[PDB]
């Protein structure tokens, strides 16, 4: 019951999804060969959410892996937790779309969305009662942004009732490995406004800040960042897998999280996070957990929440805790930091609680916050886009694939429209 279809596109999406499947398979007691070796019965009671049951009690993850360059696919296959994905679930192309939004969305990636949709339909009909689709991709590339927008649109055209939550990586101001990435980012925000229900924003600058400050790690590679993203991904859908006292699913989160249809650009966080040389000098209690989750530094988006007002926040505790502590502490959060919440909506906090904690831990929290400061995360992009428009640069690589100039202006204007919408309610 309540099955979730997973889609990965692009290099970042593929790597984050690989880490995510490794993380979940550890929690449900799945071996890298597919067999179940676990200690608790509860793990194998809702394995139908993420896994299909094949013969010989071997569980195949319900994931679809797409990209326009074959090489990355091999990287997924020849890795840990790699011979579990279905061989026919790897849909791939020949050339990796460069950094062209137009190539992925229009010319070379259009001859692959048909196969992806075929696999999507095949997976979606062997499910008892579908709950939604979740997709991991990275705005700023060619296959990620373009193929993800095309796929998302073509799926909401066919399933305009399910929940589409997207875990997307947004361009950062300091870290930047591309020169035409603002173009792709601007061309995609527009499609994410009217085709997704939840949009979790991630930037590599924030993850690097977390790995440098909170954890104090010497050489933080992409593995740690993918690990944190997998942690927050697993934490959101926990009240569908394990049992608790205040269970809240994706639709309940959306209802309590989105006051206006265009206002669904959240920002994530994961509470229990310490170094390896400090786990003994700190007590793992509910007060400490809720103090770390609302810390400005401990936020996986490069926007300062102090510059805006939280529209609404949802927290999903996992472990064995008393309701009174949770309610009292996350009421006291909104009496102290009172100026950081809007006033027209009282009780700006949603609380869920799942009994089973993550493995190796006792209590953990996943934080999802909708606040106006996310406008900055888009505002910067517009500025960059503007600087690349009046002196039209690298536009021939985009206009040579059928994209007209008017599309750029329309997408940009839609971006400022969303920014203005986020801004007006803050004042």
């Amino acid at each position: 019951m309540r099955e979730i279809v997973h889609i990965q596109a692009g290099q970042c999406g593929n790597q984050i999804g690989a880490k995510f499947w490794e993380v979940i398979s550890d929690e449900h007691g799945i071996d890298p060969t597919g067999t179940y070796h676990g200690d608790s019965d509860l793990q194998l009671d809702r394995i139908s959410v993420y896994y299909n049951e094949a013969t010989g009690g071997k569980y195949v993850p319900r994931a679809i892996l797409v990209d326009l360059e074959p090489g990355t696919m091999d990287s997924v296959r020849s890795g840990p937790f790699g011979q579990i994905f279905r061989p026919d679930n790897f849909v791939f192309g020949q050339s990796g779309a460069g950094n062209n939004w137009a190539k992925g969305h229009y010319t070379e990636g259009a001859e692959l969305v048909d196969s992806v949709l075929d696999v999507v339909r095949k997976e979606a009909e062997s499910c008892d009662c579908l709950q939604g689709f979740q997709l991991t991709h990275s705005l700023g590339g060619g296959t990620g942004s373009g193929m993800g927008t095309l796929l998302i649109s073509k799926i909401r055209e066919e399933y305009p009732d399910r929940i589409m939550n997207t875990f997307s990586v947004v361009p950062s101001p300091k870290v930047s490995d591309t020169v035409v990435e603002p173009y792709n980012a601007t061309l995609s925000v527009h499609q994410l406004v009217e085709n997704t229900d939840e949009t979790y924003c991630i930037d590599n600058e924030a993850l690097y800040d977390i790995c440098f400050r909170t954890l104090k790690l010497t050489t933080p590679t992409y593995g740690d960042l993918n690990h944190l993203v997998s942690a927050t991904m697993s934490g959101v859908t926990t009240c569908l897998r394990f049992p608790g006292q205040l269970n809240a699913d994706l639709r309940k989160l959306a209802v309590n999280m989105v006051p206006f249809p265009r206002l669904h650009f959240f920002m994530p966080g994961f509470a229990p996070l310490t170094s390896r040389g400090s786990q003994q000098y700190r007590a793992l209690t509910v007060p400490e957990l809720t103090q770390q989750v609302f810390d400005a530094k401990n936020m996986m988006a490069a926007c300062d929440p102090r510059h805006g007002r939280y529209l609404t926040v949802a927290a999903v505790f996992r472990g064995r805790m008393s309701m009174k502590e949770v309610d009292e502490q996350m009421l006291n959060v909104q009496n102290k930091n009172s100026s950081y919440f809007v006033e027209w909506i009282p009780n700006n906090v949603k609380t869920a609680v799942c009994d089973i904690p993550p493995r190796g831990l006792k209590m953990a929290v996943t934080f999802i916050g909708n606040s106006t400061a996310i406008q900055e995360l888009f505002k910067r992009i517009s500025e960059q886009f503007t600087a690349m428009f009046r002196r039209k640069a690298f536009l021939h690589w985009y206009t040579g694939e059928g994209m007209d100039e008017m599309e750029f202006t329309e997408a940009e204007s839609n971006m400022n429209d969303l920014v203005s919408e986020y801004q007006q309610y803050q004042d």
Partner: protein, 517 residues
């Protein structure tokens, strides 16, 4: 010579062929690879992939002539113009409007105990009279079975029609739609009168099952033992409409007024049904892309009441053009197709332009010298001089005084495709509505963006649930009409409905003119 493709003519093949031979046009019975001047399809516009030329099928007319769509358009217009659109008896769509039908019947019965109405139930997809029956009470509807999932139409039955030889008859009239922009409608001077095989009586519970005396369908009456096949145009179960009109005039009935109101109801149906055709044309043939021109022949079914008030029954996008031989059917249909083809000869416009260009006088430098006995041959023979006169009279689409205020939904239909976008998708998304609101400046302190979004969501949900298919991703044209009606109700309070909608259209047009300027 004009090339005509008749590979998909079907029942219109033979009647076309002689017509093709009457115009000395040369045919492709099996088609060709190269583009053809005129393509003649029988059922669907999507029969062949046509990129240029002319096609005898407007896009989507199969769906429009369906009973529920025509009924929806008729009720929309009746809301817009009740008095004008009274020719269509009140209708309900099952199973969606069953409760409303029951409540209305109960309230009218309570108001008038002596009221004994008769209703007729017709399937949407049913043709040739199949599935059509008569009821006297809403409880008489057969609601137990697996056949009730199909949408149906319950209509007020005309219990008092005109009777000729004690037989109730209907009229099938052939109407030509030449173009949608500009609108051009032509009406044939003669039609086919189909008569019942049994004497007509007022509907009673004892004779509801008698379909022969209550249904004028040719396919149903042909199996009756009382059906008479006659070669004369004034006898038999199938006759010429001109003969019936002349018999009526023989009793002192003003046939000119009768013809005028037939023309009025035909034009009213066409205008009421046009805007969805413009939407479908934009969806299927986008502006700026190569595409063929379109026209259509429609079979209008009219029941002539004893008080000479017409009633529009069924409408058919694909009327039976088969002439088998039947003298009346041939004489009507072959002439209809011949006039149709003559009206749209691709060289007529070129010939007219050349004649107009050749008539420009060259004035200047007069100087005369003698010339002797050079007789110019009479090289101006009309190629159509041997053809009979066209019976599809050029009834003025620009009736003005007769028909100028009827263009209301058609007038505002362009607003839908203005914000449609790229690729001509059939539906309009929330961004389209919000851009429309921000463009025509309908938003204010009273109506903020949240209210607009709530209205859009509610209307879209209602119209998606209304249709048989539950997806309906987006907004159709009828939902846009409902939204425009609500917006026009909000503005210009304490004003008549005709003044409303029109005033909002004027304001929106003014704001648009400011925007482009």
């Amino acid at each position: 010579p004009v090339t005509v493709d008749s590979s998909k003519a079907r029942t219109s093949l033979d009647a076309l062929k002689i017509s093709i031979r009457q115009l000395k046009w040369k045919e492709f019975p099996f088609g060709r690879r190269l583009p053809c001047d005129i393509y003649w399809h029988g059922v669907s516009f999507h029969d062949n992939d046509i990129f240029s030329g002319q096609v005898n099928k407007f896009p989507g007319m199969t769906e429009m002539v369906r009973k529920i769509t025509l009924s929806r358009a008729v009720r929309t217009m009746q809301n817009l113009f009740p008095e004008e659109y009274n020719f269509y008896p009140r209708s309900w769509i099952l199973p969606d409007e069953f409760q409303l039908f029951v409540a209305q019947v109960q309230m009218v019965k309570d108001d008038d105990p002596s009221w004994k109405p008769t209703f007729i139930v017709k399937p949407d997809g049913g043709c040739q009279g199949d599935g059509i029956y008569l009821i006297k009470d809403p409880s008489d509807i057969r609601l137990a079975g697996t056949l009730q999932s199909r949408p149906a139409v319950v209509q007020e039955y005309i219990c008092k029609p005109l009777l000729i030889d004690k037989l109730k008859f209907d009229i099938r009239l052939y109407v030509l739609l030449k173009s949608l922009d500009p609108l051009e409608i032509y009406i044939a001077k003669d039609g086919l009168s189909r008569f019942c095989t049994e004497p007509y009586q007022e509907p009673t519970p004892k004779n509801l099952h008698r379909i022969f005396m209550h249904l004028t369908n040719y396919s149903l009456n042909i199996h009756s033992g009382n059906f008479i096949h006659s070669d004369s145009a004034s006898t038999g179960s199938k006759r010429t409409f001109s003969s019936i009109l002349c018999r009526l005039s023989s009793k002192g009935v003003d046939i000119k007024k009768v013809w005028s109101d037939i023309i009025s109801v035909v034009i009213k149906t066409v205008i009421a049904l046009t805007p969805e055709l413009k939407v479908f044309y934009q969806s299927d043939i986008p502006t700026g892309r190569p595409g063929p021109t379109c026209f259509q022949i429609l079979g209008f079914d009219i029941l002539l009441m004893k008080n000479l008030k017409p009633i529009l029954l069924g409408v058919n996008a694909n009327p039976s053009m088969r002439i088998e031989p039947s003298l009346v059917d041939e004489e009507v249909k072959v002439a209809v197709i011949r006039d149709t083809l003559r009206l749209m000869d691709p060289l007529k416009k070129k010939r007219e332009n050349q004649s107009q260009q050749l008539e420009k006088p060259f004035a200047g430098k007069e100087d005369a010298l003698d010339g002797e006995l050079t007789s110019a041959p009479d090289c101006n023979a009309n190629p159509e001089a041997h053809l009979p006169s066209i019976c599809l009279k050029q009834v003025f689409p620009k009736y003005a005084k007769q028909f100028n205020y009827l263009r209301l939904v058609d007038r505002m239909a362009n607003l839908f495709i203005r914000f449609l976008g790229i690729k001509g998708t059939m539906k309009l998304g929330p961004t389209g509505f919000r851009t429309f609101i921000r463009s025509c400046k309908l938003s204010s302190s009273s109506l903020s963006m949240a209210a607009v979004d709530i209205l859009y969501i509610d209307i879209t949900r209602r119209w998606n649930s209304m249709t048989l298919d539950q997806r309906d991703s987006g907004m159709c044209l009828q939902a846009f009409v409902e939204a425009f009606f609500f917006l026009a109700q909000r503005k210009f309070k304490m004003l008549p409905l005709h003044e409303q909608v029109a005033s909002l259209i004027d304001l929106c047009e003014y704001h648009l003119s400011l925007l482009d300027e």
